Amino acid sequence: IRNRLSELLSERGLKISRVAKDVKIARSSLTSMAQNDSEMIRYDAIDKLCSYLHISPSEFFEHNPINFDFTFDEEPNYKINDVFEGFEVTANITHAFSIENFDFEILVDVELDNRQKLNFDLDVSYKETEKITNSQHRFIFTIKNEDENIGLKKYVDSLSAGLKNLLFKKINQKLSGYVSEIIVKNIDDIEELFPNKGEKSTTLHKEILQTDSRLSSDIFKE
Amino acid sequence: IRNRLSELLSERGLKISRVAKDVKIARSSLTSMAQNDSEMIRYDAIDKLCSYLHISPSEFFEHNPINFDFTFDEEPNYKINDVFEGFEVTANITHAFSIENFDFEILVDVELDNRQKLNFDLDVSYKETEKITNSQHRFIFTIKNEDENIGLKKYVDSLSAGLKNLLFKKINQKLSGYVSEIIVKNIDDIEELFKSTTLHKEILQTDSRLSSDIFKE
Amino acid sequence: IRNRLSELLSERGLKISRVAKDVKIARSSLTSMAQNDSEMIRYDAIDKLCSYLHISPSEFFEHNPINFDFTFDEEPNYKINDVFEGFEVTANITHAFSIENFDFEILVDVELDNRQKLNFDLDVSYKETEKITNSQHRFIFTIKNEDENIGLKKYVDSLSAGLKNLLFKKINQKLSGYVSEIIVKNIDDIEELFKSTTLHKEILQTDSRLSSDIFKE
Amino acid sequence: IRNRLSELLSERGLKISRVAKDVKIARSSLTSMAQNDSEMIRYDAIDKLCSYLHISPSEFFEHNPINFDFTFDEEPNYKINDVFEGFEVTANITHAFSIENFDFEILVDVELDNRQKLNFDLDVSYKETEKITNSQHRFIFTIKNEDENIGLKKYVDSLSAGLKNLLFKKINQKLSGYVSEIIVKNIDDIEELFPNKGEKSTTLHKEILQTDSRLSSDIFKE
């Protein structure tokens, strides 16, 4: 499920600030709720927004009964070589360390409208530490058994594009958090000797937690 | 905005505990959210309920574009009479005191789907005290200018029964807090000594309800 | 899941001690495991029993794919009445107190072999207290909504007699622990002037059993 | 006897973690019980697994009435020369010492379905300290009278492959424990002067106990 605020105001052409001025809702909370990322919503908010946009909650709440629940391995098969390439000198994840391999299993329960639930196992392995910017990097993972989970992809693409993007976000966020958690327990705190361009000094921990690892596979293209 | 989980469960006879077990949600939260009492709802909760009940969020969330806002006079016209006798024998606010007058105007903007909204002013004066329990009494306020609020009644009963009840609950709470704030400041503490509860706490617990043809429920 | 060691021994007339000697297993463990009371079984034990009894583990372990799960209300509807008199003279909880009301719903999921499972809600209220012994009394709870549990009876008696008895034992223990936890907190310990007994301990020892057409044994 | 979990989930293709998520059983305990190594099992576990897999305990419990009980010599004929080749410097069993000879008798009281039990004596002698890895070694033993115990082999191979593997495991484990026990009593504690690659320092004792001696003979091929 997700609110369609982003799609609604894109269609209307209105801006979040403009809506906030109209419905007396805090800009930060409203803009966060505009994104599907927010997990909690207020009844006052749904009343004010549905009235302002003159629309029933039907158009506000995009719901598909297919629920995708994800579970990760308590213990993964992870090897992380430590390369002491002056991380403190240069705040680059590559300089701090490198993932030799990171493979594990993601348990995906694809529940249909009926309680009948289908479980798909994902052998996901670290592939490359993609460098998005000179400042930060994004870890990239890949599903070895993605061809086996072709039915999963059929179910994923069977949803709306907005809901597909919401799943991709959820998967990425869970995976990022998991990977950062494992690495931060495996790698000792490496603080940056020099604050970068007046930005307060940030430790490797802050960098890896900030690091967002998005899975890459034909199962999840967009 | 009206959660129909409660209605839906009455339709299907499903016990709240049964739903909570199936959707792995706390019974307390589910029961609080059942009558749309809680003003916050989790996306996970509604997703799970919709999938479990085989419904679109339309049957869960019932919304009428019409909106009602209520603004109370900053200064009301109130007169107080304190008997100070009898609260000690039995915990009755009326024995302790009563409000001789409490007439005040309450703004009520009934907003149409069109941006234009209609402002209606209702003057409610202290009518009597409802003896809901021998211990708790709820102040009753009657609308004097119901003529100006003839269209109010039409707008109020134009909403669903659940929505009407919601409105009645909100206005009742708001009125109760308003009158309690106004009165507790002018009232001393009396000990029940059945215990020995402070009359202040009795003022806090005592509520008030608008009895009028415009709001019969 | 039903160990038939007990049944098998009754078939062959073999004394538990005789089997324990032949298979070099402790009599205490073998007798505890005989009625499938223990929830842990050693691979060595079952191997030795199967070889000794000339049986496949099929005749030892009887399993019905059907599964029963029981969830009790987090908050039950219970009222307590404490006489406080009599328990001292004679060790009877009845004299010490009794439960005026103890109605609560138990959500029971009977799971079929197919992944789909059937949820049935039974409401059990305090019916009376069973005087099993002049000293120990077991609370009796009757199912009010047995109509919703007509299929529950069919599923229950669809299982083997041993499995039925197993279920009855489990539900009885669970109900007894539930009611004891609920009551001991609202009850004080009475020490008999008369050998001396504590009422809390009596609450712990006192059990409860669901007397209903759905569970007659 | 052994549970057929490994064979069951191999046939199903499911993973232990996937089963654990389904039957609400702890991953570690379930994965251990998936292996035939676990000696204890819970009735709740057998109920949940048999139901999840929709199978009777018949398919869950592979039982063969032929019971193989093993007994070892209280006192063996063992000679262990001590070579002080810097074990503390290099954590290799060869560097710590070397088995001159280790021969003894392994009594096997094989029991058929009937109480009739046949006993087979195994003159087992140390043959070679096989080096599995640069880090650890596996002691290899051999049965001198294996040709005499040809009937024993006939009984061993008369069982299922899974049960045969379970026996091999049991024999190996008992033999390893026995050999490590004898050696640790015969060889003084040699602690490693340097922890190996950040692994906390491990003493010869930990190495020999970790050392797993698997018997090698035509009686037990797989």
In terms of CA atoms, which chain A residue is nearest residue C114? A116
Closest approach of C45 to chain B, Cα-based (Å): 38
Residue C73: list chain B partners with CB under 8 A: 17, 27
CA distances from A81 to A96, A101, A206 (A): 10, 9, 19
Interface of B with C in 9-28 (CB under 8 A): 15, 17-18, 21-22, 27-28
**Would you say C210 and C143 are in contact if contact means Cβ atoms under 8 Å apart?**
yes
Radius of gyration over every alpha carbon of chain A, rounded to an integer in angstroms? 21
Distant-in-sequence, close-in-space partners of B184: CB < 8 Å, separation ≥ 6: B200, B203, B204
3-state secondary structure of B56: coil
Interface of D with C in 49-78 (CB under 8 A): 50-51, 54, 56-58, 61, 63, 65, 67
Determine the length of chain A: 222
In terms of CA atoms, which chain C residue is nearest residue D47? C1
Residue A74: list chain D partners with CB under 8 A: 17, 27
- CB burial of residue D221 (10 Å; 0-12, 13-18, 19+): exposed
- CB burial of residue D3 (10 Å; 0-12, 13-18, 19+): buried
Distant-in-sequence, close-in-space partners of D22: CB < 8 Å, separation ≥ 6: A119, D52
- What is d(CA C96, CA C83) in angstroms, rounded to the nearest whole number? 5
How many Cβ pairs closer than 8 A exist between chain A and B? 76
In terms of CA atoms, which chain A residue is nearest residue B114? A54
Inter-chain touch C57–D56, beta carbons under 8 Å? no
Within an 8 Å CB–CB cutoff, is residue C121 touching chain B? yes
Residue B40: list chain A partners with CB under 8 A: 40-43
CA distances from A19 to A22, A38, A46, B113 (A): 5, 17, 13, 16
The pair of three-digit structure tokens given for residue D126, joined into one six-digit string: 């140390």
Distant-in-sequence, close-in-space partners of B164: CB < 8 Å, separation ≥ 6: B156, B157, B217
- What is d(CA B106, CA B212) in angstroms, rounded to the nearest whole number? 14
Q: What are phi and psi of B43, to 5 degrees?
A: -55, -40
- Provide the resolution (angstroms): 3.9
Inter-chain touch A119–D27, beta carbons under 8 Å? no
Inter-chain touch A116–C117, beta carbons under 8 Å? no
- What is d(CA C165, CA C162) in angstroms, rounded to the nearest whole number? 5
- What sign for the dihedral angle of Cα D154, D160, D165, D171? negative
**Would you say B146 and B123 are in contact if contact means Cβ atoms under 8 Å apart?**
no
**Residue indicated by tokens 């372990």:** C61
Per the rule left: phi > 0, alpha: psi between -120 and 50, beta: everything else, A204 is alpha
Residue C66: list chain D partners with CB under 8 A: 51
Most D CBs within 10 Å: which of C19, C35, C61, C115, as the mutation test of the D interface? C61
The pair of three-digit structure tokens given for residue B38, joined into one six-digit string: 């809680």
Inter-chain touch B22–C119, beta carbons under 8 Å? yes
Query: Are chains D and B touching, using the cut-off of 8 Å on CB pairs and a minimum of 3 such pairs?
Result: no
Expt. technique: cryo-EM
- CB burial of residue B147 (10 Å; 0-12, 13-18, 19+): exposed
The pair of three-digit structure tokens given for residue B179, joined into one six-digit string: 């009158």
Long-range CB contacts (< 8 A, 24+ apart) of C184-187?
Answer: C186/C80, C187/C80, C187/C82, C187/C96, C187/C97
Closest approach of A110 to chain C, Cα-based (Å): 14
Question: Which residue type does C201 have?
Answer: K
Name the residue among B7, B8, B1, B12 with its Cα closest to residue B41.
B1
**Would you say A107 and A118 are in contact if contact means Cβ atoms under 8 Å apart?**
no
Alpha-helical segments (H) within A53-149: 57-60, 93-96
Please spell the DSSP secondary structure of D136-202, one letter per residue.
--EEEEEETTTTTTHHHHHHHHTS-HHHHHHHHHHHHHHHHHHHHHHHHHHS-----SS-BTTB---
Closest approach of D27 to chain A, Cα-based (Å): 8
Residue D21: list chain A partners with CB under 8 A: 71, 107, 109, 119
Going by the DSSP 8-state scheme, the letter that residue C1 receives in this structure is -
**Would you say A176 and A132 are in contact if contact means Cβ atoms under 8 Å apart?**
no
Residues facing D125 on adjacent strands: D103, D142
